[PDB]
């Protein structure tokens, strides 16, 4: 029934099916080498497939992203053992910059590379550690990524829909159904991911690396374009400094299309600012205004049903959390409160 997911899942599967460096059997050997902390071996394994003579001219986005994925697991691994990958692998940096050029993404692996663009089968899935907890971590993102992309499209569409129209309530109800997948992700994480194993065994693989004379953050679900959705939905005109910096920090890591969505809405009132201004002008005696606001409140409810438990999970891992999480939750409650007050 979440019919819009299909196309996004299909585009992900295209990258996941691609192995342009014929590296599948090679990357599967990485977990054992990480367990052994075998740095020379990690470099040697990478050199078995790293292009030395530039990128094949026939490659498009799909091949370049797939290549970045397979090289990428080596980047996080080398840094995990205390080494700048660019410093220990000659000729690596130019390849990373070429792949960045070909994908219009940063010159290292991102969330997309390690989750939705990473095949799912046991004989193919790339991993830093080979641990069950890592496999569960990747699955938690696959549960909701395509749904989130659909949700972004639905939010952009809703922005131009009048609150006076019955379409507003209907589109909002639809948006809520897609955002429920984020809740499913966190439920999944609670059930299957050890916060201790995350903190002690997985987290070390996601440190920043230096390429091209700047630092690039490691993969994380923090890179999910949920912040772009909410930029459009409520946050575009926020004067909260910490929040603004958070969005600008992760902007480079999302797909080009979402970076442009973000740019489009930055110089404008957010959806709810427009929605509430309309409600105050027309009045809540209009049934479609009442229904629209009610449906919009339910959208905030589902964001909070993701965000509140997520914070507890993050705090539990650190018990074995960064301040921006609690700050973002507070902003989200305030956003919902504005809708509640309008009614
Ligand atoms: C034990 C598992 C998890 C831990 C320990 C964790 C931890 C964190 C931390 C510490 C942050 C703040 C950013 C940072 O400093 O890295 C964060 C942000 C974020 N996380 Fe998680 N996380 C977990 C699971 C998940 C899952 C399953 C999802 C969704 C699939 C998710 C989605 C997000 C998003 C979208 C952000 C950006 C901030 C926000 O929207 O509130 N996380 N996470
Ligand atoms: N949200 C956390 C933990 C997390 C969830 N899914 C992930 C996938 C890859 C790396 C980290 C994660 C983070 O961004 O760090």
Short mmCIF file of C-alpha atoms and ligand atoms in Angstrom, two decimals:
data_model
loop_
_atom_site.label_atom_id
_atom_site.label_comp_id
_atom_site.label_asym_id
_atom_site.label_seq_id
_atom_site.Cartn_x
_atom_site.Cartn_y
_atom_site.Cartn_z
CA UNK A 1 0.00 0.00 0.00
CA UNK A 2 3.06 2.25 0.48
CA UNK A 3 3.15 2.21 -3.32
CA UNK A 4 5.67 5.07 -3.74
CA UNK A 5 8.54 3.04 -2.18
CA UNK A 6 9.00 0.82 -5.26
CA UNK A 7 10.80 3.30 -7.50
CA UNK A 8 13.26 4.37 -4.77
CA UNK A 9 14.01 0.74 -3.81
CA UNK A 10 14.57 -0.02 -7.52
CA UNK A 11 17.12 2.81 -7.89
CA UNK A 12 18.96 1.51 -4.76
CA UNK A 13 18.99 -2.05 -6.09
CA UNK A 14 20.75 -0.85 -9.29
CA UNK A 15 23.81 0.21 -7.26
CA UNK A 16 23.63 -2.87 -5.01
CA UNK A 17 23.68 -5.16 -8.06
CA UNK A 18 26.80 -3.41 -9.47
CA UNK A 19 30.34 -4.76 -8.88
CA UNK A 20 32.48 -2.84 -11.44
CA UNK A 21 35.76 -3.63 -9.68
CA UNK A 22 34.84 -7.32 -9.33
CA UNK A 23 35.53 -6.91 -5.62
CA UNK A 24 32.81 -9.03 -3.95
CA UNK A 25 34.98 -12.00 -2.91
CA UNK A 26 37.73 -9.59 -1.86
CA UNK A 27 35.71 -7.28 0.41
CA UNK A 28 34.25 -10.35 2.20
CA UNK A 29 37.79 -10.93 3.58
CA UNK A 30 37.84 -7.52 5.31
CA UNK A 31 36.08 -8.55 8.60
CA UNK A 32 38.72 -11.24 9.35
CA UNK A 33 41.50 -8.73 8.70
CA UNK A 34 39.86 -6.16 11.00
CA UNK A 35 39.48 -8.79 13.77
CA UNK A 36 43.21 -9.46 13.36
CA UNK A 37 43.98 -5.70 13.24
CA UNK A 38 46.13 -6.53 10.19
CA UNK A 39 46.82 -3.08 8.69
CA UNK A 40 49.38 -4.16 6.04
CA UNK A 41 46.90 -6.91 5.02
CA UNK A 42 44.02 -4.40 4.74
CA UNK A 43 46.13 -2.18 2.45
CA UNK A 44 47.23 -5.25 0.42
CA UNK A 45 43.64 -6.42 -0.01
CA UNK A 46 42.56 -2.96 -1.20
CA UNK A 47 45.44 -2.82 -3.71
CA UNK A 48 44.12 -6.07 -5.27
CA UNK A 49 41.21 -4.07 -6.76
CA UNK A 50 41.92 -0.32 -6.45
CA UNK A 51 42.09 1.21 -9.97
CA UNK A 52 45.63 2.50 -10.59
CA UNK A 53 45.13 3.97 -14.06
CA UNK A 54 42.00 6.08 -13.61
CA UNK A 55 38.31 5.19 -13.91
CA UNK A 56 37.00 3.24 -16.95
CA UNK A 57 35.44 5.76 -19.35
CA UNK A 58 32.21 3.73 -19.68
CA UNK A 59 31.24 4.19 -16.00
CA UNK A 60 28.21 6.23 -14.98
CA UNK A 61 26.83 7.11 -11.56
CA UNK A 62 25.92 3.49 -10.76
CA UNK A 63 29.43 2.10 -11.31
CA UNK A 64 31.19 5.03 -9.57
CA UNK A 65 28.92 4.73 -6.47
CA UNK A 66 29.44 0.95 -6.35
CA UNK A 67 33.23 1.48 -6.61
CA UNK A 68 33.07 4.05 -3.79
CA UNK A 69 31.17 1.53 -1.67
CA UNK A 70 33.78 -1.21 -2.10
CA UNK A 71 36.81 1.07 -1.57
CA UNK A 72 34.87 2.81 1.24
CA UNK A 73 34.83 -0.08 3.70
CA UNK A 74 38.64 0.04 3.58
CA UNK A 75 38.61 3.77 4.43
CA UNK A 76 36.68 3.35 7.67
CA UNK A 77 38.73 0.25 8.53
CA UNK A 78 42.11 1.94 8.11
CA UNK A 79 41.00 4.94 10.18
CA UNK A 80 39.62 2.55 12.87
CA UNK A 81 43.17 1.23 13.36
CA UNK A 82 44.56 4.79 13.63
CA UNK A 83 45.65 5.47 10.03
CA UNK A 84 44.67 8.14 7.51
CA UNK A 85 43.83 5.99 4.44
CA UNK A 86 45.18 8.65 2.04
CA UNK A 87 48.51 8.58 3.87
CA UNK A 88 49.01 4.80 3.79
CA UNK A 89 47.61 3.99 0.31
CA UNK A 90 49.48 5.76 -2.52
CA UNK A 91 47.25 6.74 -5.44
CA UNK A 92 44.11 6.38 -3.31
CA UNK A 93 43.31 10.08 -2.95
CA UNK A 94 43.07 10.84 -6.73
CA UNK A 95 40.69 7.85 -7.15
CA UNK A 96 38.49 9.11 -4.26
CA UNK A 97 38.36 12.63 -5.79
CA UNK A 98 37.49 11.16 -9.25
CA UNK A 99 34.62 9.09 -7.76
CA UNK A 100 33.35 12.15 -5.85
CA UNK A 101 33.30 13.98 -9.22
CA UNK A 102 31.39 11.14 -10.89
CA UNK A 103 28.74 10.86 -8.16
CA UNK A 104 28.53 14.51 -6.93
CA UNK A 105 28.93 13.07 -3.42
CA UNK A 106 31.82 13.37 -0.90
CA UNK A 107 35.12 11.46 -1.58
CA UNK A 108 34.45 8.60 0.86
CA UNK A 109 31.70 6.13 1.78
CA UNK A 110 28.41 7.48 3.11
CA UNK A 111 25.34 5.95 4.71
CA UNK A 112 23.87 5.24 1.23
CA UNK A 113 26.94 3.23 0.19
CA UNK A 114 26.93 0.94 3.22
CA UNK A 115 23.15 0.37 3.48
CA UNK A 116 20.79 0.71 0.49
CA UNK A 117 23.55 0.48 -2.13
CA UNK A 118 25.09 -2.57 -0.41
CA UNK A 119 23.71 -5.99 -1.52
CA UNK A 120 21.79 -7.94 1.10
CA UNK A 121 22.84 -11.56 0.44
CA UNK A 122 25.28 -13.30 2.81
CA UNK A 123 27.71 -14.07 -0.03
CA UNK A 124 27.75 -10.39 -1.18
CA UNK A 125 26.97 -7.94 1.67
CA UNK A 126 29.93 -5.71 2.49
CA UNK A 127 30.72 -5.13 6.18
CA UNK A 128 33.43 -3.58 8.37
CA UNK A 129 33.18 -6.19 11.14
CA UNK A 130 31.07 -9.14 9.95
CA UNK A 131 29.17 -8.92 13.27
CA UNK A 132 25.40 -9.70 13.55
CA UNK A 133 24.94 -6.32 15.27
CA UNK A 134 26.35 -4.58 12.17
CA UNK A 135 24.01 -6.59 9.90
CA UNK A 136 21.07 -5.47 12.09
CA UNK A 137 22.33 -1.88 11.98
CA UNK A 138 22.28 -1.92 8.14
CA UNK A 139 18.81 -3.52 8.09
CA UNK A 140 17.40 -0.79 10.38
CA UNK A 141 18.22 1.77 7.65
CA UNK A 142 16.96 -0.39 4.76
CA UNK A 143 13.58 -0.59 6.57
CA UNK A 144 12.96 3.17 6.19
CA UNK A 145 15.23 4.82 3.58
CA UNK A 146 12.98 4.35 0.50
CA UNK A 147 9.94 5.36 2.57
CA UNK A 148 11.78 8.49 3.74
CA UNK A 149 12.62 9.47 0.14
CA UNK A 150 8.95 9.08 -0.77
CA UNK A 151 8.07 11.14 2.33
CA UNK A 152 10.36 13.96 1.11
CA UNK A 153 8.51 13.99 -2.23
CA UNK A 154 5.15 14.03 -0.39
CA UNK A 155 6.28 16.95 1.82
CA UNK A 156 7.35 19.05 -1.17
CA UNK A 157 3.96 18.30 -2.76
CA UNK A 158 2.05 19.15 0.44
CA UNK A 159 3.81 22.55 0.65
CA UNK A 160 1.80 23.78 -2.37
CA UNK A 161 -1.53 22.35 -1.12
CA UNK A 162 -4.04 24.73 0.45
CA UNK A 163 -5.29 23.93 3.96
CA UNK A 164 -8.80 24.79 2.68
CA UNK A 165 -8.63 21.75 0.36
CA UNK A 166 -9.59 18.21 1.51
CA UNK A 167 -6.35 17.17 -0.24
CA UNK A 168 -4.35 18.64 2.65
CA UNK A 169 -5.73 16.17 5.22
CA UNK A 170 -5.39 13.27 2.72
CA UNK A 171 -1.78 14.07 1.75
CA UNK A 172 -0.85 14.59 5.43
CA UNK A 173 -2.37 11.19 6.34
CA UNK A 174 -0.35 9.65 3.51
CA UNK A 175 2.85 11.40 4.67
CA UNK A 176 2.29 10.03 8.19
CA UNK A 177 2.08 6.45 6.83
CA UNK A 178 5.50 6.78 5.16
CA UNK A 179 7.12 8.37 8.23
CA UNK A 180 5.92 5.41 10.35
CA UNK A 181 8.80 3.42 8.77
CA UNK A 182 11.25 5.54 10.84
CA UNK A 183 9.41 4.28 13.94
CA UNK A 184 9.71 0.70 12.61
CA UNK A 185 13.48 1.28 12.27
CA UNK A 186 13.92 2.31 15.92
CA UNK A 187 11.71 -0.54 17.16
CA UNK A 188 13.94 -2.86 15.13
CA UNK A 189 17.07 -1.28 16.62
CA UNK A 190 15.71 -1.74 20.18
CA UNK A 191 14.96 -5.41 19.53
CA UNK A 192 18.13 -6.42 17.68
CA UNK A 193 21.06 -4.03 18.20
CA UNK A 194 23.19 -4.15 21.35
CA UNK A 195 23.93 -0.52 22.32
CA UNK A 196 27.17 -1.77 23.95
CA UNK A 197 28.32 -3.61 20.83
CA UNK A 198 27.45 -0.51 18.79
CA UNK A 199 29.52 1.75 21.02
CA UNK A 200 32.49 -0.58 21.49
CA UNK A 201 32.68 -2.47 18.19
CA UNK A 202 30.90 -0.52 15.43
CA UNK A 203 31.24 3.19 16.27
CA UNK A 204 35.09 3.06 15.93
CA UNK A 205 34.70 2.40 12.18
CA UNK A 206 32.81 5.67 11.54
CA UNK A 207 35.48 8.27 12.36
CA UNK A 208 36.28 11.19 9.99
CA UNK A 209 39.06 10.94 7.39
CA UNK A 210 41.01 13.66 5.57
CA UNK A 211 40.78 13.93 1.77
CA UNK A 212 41.51 16.99 -0.35
CA UNK A 213 42.64 18.98 2.67
CA UNK A 214 39.41 18.72 4.62
CA UNK A 215 37.74 16.27 6.99
CA UNK A 216 34.82 14.04 5.93
CA UNK A 217 32.53 12.39 8.49
CA UNK A 218 32.02 8.62 8.47
CA UNK A 219 28.76 6.86 7.64
CA UNK A 220 25.80 7.17 9.99
CA UNK A 221 22.02 7.22 9.90
CA UNK A 222 22.50 10.84 10.96
CA UNK A 223 23.08 11.25 7.18
CA UNK A 224 19.50 10.15 6.36
CA UNK A 225 17.81 13.12 4.61
CA UNK A 226 15.18 13.37 7.38
CA UNK A 227 16.69 16.76 8.22
CA UNK A 228 15.86 17.91 4.66
CA UNK A 229 12.23 16.74 5.04
CA UNK A 230 11.90 18.63 8.32
CA UNK A 231 13.68 21.69 6.89
CA UNK A 232 10.74 21.94 4.46
CA UNK A 233 8.16 20.83 7.05
CA UNK A 234 9.04 23.11 10.02
CA UNK A 235 12.71 24.15 10.29
CA UNK A 236 13.63 26.31 7.27
CA UNK A 237 13.11 29.63 9.11
CA UNK A 238 14.47 28.51 12.50
CA UNK A 239 16.89 30.95 14.14
CA UNK A 240 18.36 28.17 16.31
CA UNK A 241 22.12 28.32 15.66
CA UNK A 242 22.92 24.76 16.79
CA UNK A 243 20.11 23.38 14.58
CA UNK A 244 21.23 25.40 11.53
CA UNK A 245 24.83 24.16 11.96
CA UNK A 246 23.57 20.57 12.29
CA UNK A 247 21.75 20.75 8.92
CA UNK A 248 24.67 22.47 7.17
CA UNK A 249 27.03 19.81 8.57
CA UNK A 250 25.22 16.87 6.95
CA UNK A 251 23.95 18.57 3.80
CA UNK A 252 26.98 17.50 1.67
CA UNK A 253 26.29 13.81 2.46
CA UNK A 254 22.77 13.53 1.00
CA UNK A 255 21.84 13.02 -2.69
CA UNK A 256 22.22 16.06 -4.99
CA UNK A 257 18.43 16.22 -5.46
CA UNK A 258 17.91 16.66 -1.69
CA UNK A 259 20.63 19.30 -1.47
CA UNK A 260 18.65 21.27 -4.09
CA UNK A 261 15.37 20.69 -2.21
CA UNK A 262 17.10 22.18 0.87
CA UNK A 263 18.37 25.20 -1.13
CA UNK A 264 14.91 25.78 -2.63
CA UNK A 265 13.21 26.11 0.76
CA UNK A 266 15.93 27.90 2.80
CA UNK A 267 14.79 31.43 1.85
CA UNK A 268 11.15 30.75 2.73
CA UNK A 269 8.61 30.10 5.51
CA UNK A 270 8.34 26.38 6.28
CA UNK A 271 5.21 24.36 5.53
CA UNK A 272 3.73 24.73 9.01
CA UNK A 273 4.40 28.52 9.09
CA UNK A 274 2.32 28.79 5.90
CA UNK A 275 -0.26 26.27 7.17
CA UNK A 276 -0.84 28.09 10.49
CA UNK A 277 -0.97 31.52 8.81
CA UNK A 278 -3.70 30.14 6.54
CA UNK A 279 -5.62 28.61 9.48
CA UNK A 280 -5.58 31.94 11.35
CA UNK A 281 -6.82 33.78 8.24
CA UNK A 282 -9.61 31.36 7.20
CA UNK A 283 -10.62 30.09 10.65
CA UNK A 284 -10.92 26.67 12.28
CA UNK A 285 -14.69 26.63 11.64
CA UNK A 286 -13.78 25.43 8.14
CA UNK A 287 -13.96 21.62 8.37
CA UNK A 288 -11.05 21.15 5.96
CA UNK A 289 -8.90 23.47 8.11
CA UNK A 290 -9.77 21.42 11.25
CA UNK A 291 -9.03 18.11 9.47
CA UNK A 292 -5.86 19.49 7.85
CA UNK A 293 -4.40 20.67 11.15
CA UNK A 294 -5.40 17.41 12.89
CA UNK A 295 -3.69 15.36 10.17
CA UNK A 296 -0.62 17.62 10.36
CA UNK A 297 -0.46 17.09 14.15
CA UNK A 298 -0.32 13.32 13.49
CA UNK A 299 2.73 13.87 11.25
CA UNK A 300 4.53 15.51 14.20
CA UNK A 301 3.38 12.69 16.49
CA UNK A 302 5.11 10.11 14.28
CA UNK A 303 8.33 12.19 14.10
CA UNK A 304 8.30 12.27 17.92
CA UNK A 305 7.60 8.52 18.05
CA UNK A 306 10.89 8.11 16.16
CA UNK A 307 12.87 10.86 17.88
CA UNK A 308 12.05 10.26 21.57
CA UNK A 309 12.93 6.50 21.69
CA UNK A 310 15.93 7.18 19.43
CA UNK A 311 17.33 9.56 22.07
CA UNK A 312 16.97 6.87 24.78
CA UNK A 313 18.81 4.37 22.56
CA UNK A 314 21.63 6.86 21.91
CA UNK A 315 21.90 7.66 25.63
CA UNK A 316 22.06 3.92 26.45
CA UNK A 317 24.96 3.38 23.99
CA UNK A 318 26.88 6.29 25.52
CA UNK A 319 26.09 4.86 28.98
CA UNK A 320 28.63 2.23 27.84
CA UNK A 321 24.85 11.20 23.93
CA UNK A 322 25.68 14.34 21.87
CA UNK A 323 23.67 17.38 23.02
CA UNK A 324 22.12 18.21 19.63
CA UNK A 325 19.80 15.18 19.93
CA UNK A 326 17.96 16.51 22.98
CA UNK A 327 17.96 19.97 21.41
CA UNK A 328 16.36 18.66 18.22
CA UNK A 329 13.73 16.76 20.20
CA UNK A 330 12.87 19.99 22.07
CA UNK A 331 12.46 21.85 18.75
CA UNK A 332 10.19 19.10 17.44
CA UNK A 333 7.94 19.25 20.53
CA UNK A 334 7.70 23.03 20.08
CA UNK A 335 6.73 22.55 16.41
CA UNK A 336 3.95 20.09 17.35
CA UNK A 337 2.80 22.46 20.15
CA UNK A 338 2.22 25.23 17.59
CA UNK A 339 -0.11 22.92 15.62
CA UNK A 340 -1.90 21.87 18.82
CA UNK A 341 -2.38 25.54 19.81
CA UNK A 342 -3.83 26.37 16.34
CA UNK A 343 -6.55 23.84 17.16
C1 LIG B 1 22.00 1.72 18.88
C2 LIG B 1 21.67 2.34 17.74
C3 LIG B 1 21.85 3.86 17.51
C4 LIG B 1 22.65 4.72 18.15
C5 LIG B 1 23.64 4.44 19.31
C6 LIG B 1 22.46 6.03 17.58
C7 LIG B 1 23.11 7.18 17.95
C8 LIG B 1 22.94 8.43 17.40
C9 LIG B 1 23.64 9.62 17.82
C10 LIG B 1 24.69 9.67 18.95
C11 LIG B 1 23.21 10.63 17.06
C12 LIG B 1 23.69 12.08 17.14
C13 LIG B 1 24.69 12.26 15.98
C14 LIG B 1 26.11 11.81 16.28
O1 LIG B 1 26.81 12.47 17.08
O2 LIG B 1 26.57 10.78 15.70
C15 LIG B 1 22.22 10.11 16.13
C16 LIG B 1 21.53 10.83 15.18
C17 LIG B 1 20.59 10.34 14.29
N1 LIG B 1 20.18 9.02 14.19
FE1 LIG B 1 20.82 7.47 15.40
N2 LIG B 1 21.51 5.93 16.58
C18 LIG B 1 21.12 4.61 16.51
C19 LIG B 1 20.19 4.10 15.63
C20 LIG B 1 19.50 4.81 14.67
C21 LIG B 1 18.52 4.28 13.75
C22 LIG B 1 18.09 2.80 13.70
C23 LIG B 1 18.09 5.29 12.98
C24 LIG B 1 17.04 5.24 11.84
C25 LIG B 1 17.13 4.29 10.90
C26 LIG B 1 18.78 6.48 13.39
C27 LIG B 1 18.59 7.71 12.84
C28 LIG B 1 19.22 8.87 13.20
C29 LIG B 1 18.96 10.15 12.58
C30 LIG B 1 17.99 10.46 11.43
C31 LIG B 1 19.88 11.13 13.30
C32 LIG B 1 19.96 12.64 13.02
C33 LIG B 1 19.22 13.33 14.21
C34 LIG B 1 17.69 13.18 14.37
O3 LIG B 1 16.93 13.10 13.37
O4 LIG B 1 17.18 13.17 15.53
N3 LIG B 1 19.63 6.16 14.42
N4 LIG B 1 22.08 8.76 16.37
N1 LIG B 2 22.27 6.96 14.10
C1 LIG B 2 23.64 6.55 14.52
C2 LIG B 2 23.81 5.03 14.52
C3 LIG B 2 23.49 4.32 13.22
C4 LIG B 2 22.27 3.80 12.79
N2 LIG B 2 22.38 3.21 11.57
C5 LIG B 2 23.64 3.29 11.11
C6 LIG B 2 24.28 2.86 9.95
C7 LIG B 2 25.65 3.12 9.82
C8 LIG B 2 26.39 3.79 10.81
C9 LIG B 2 25.79 4.24 11.99
C10 LIG B 2 24.44 3.99 12.14
C11 LIG B 2 24.69 7.26 13.72
O1 LIG B 2 24.38 7.98 12.76
O2 LIG B 2 25.88 7.15 14.03
#
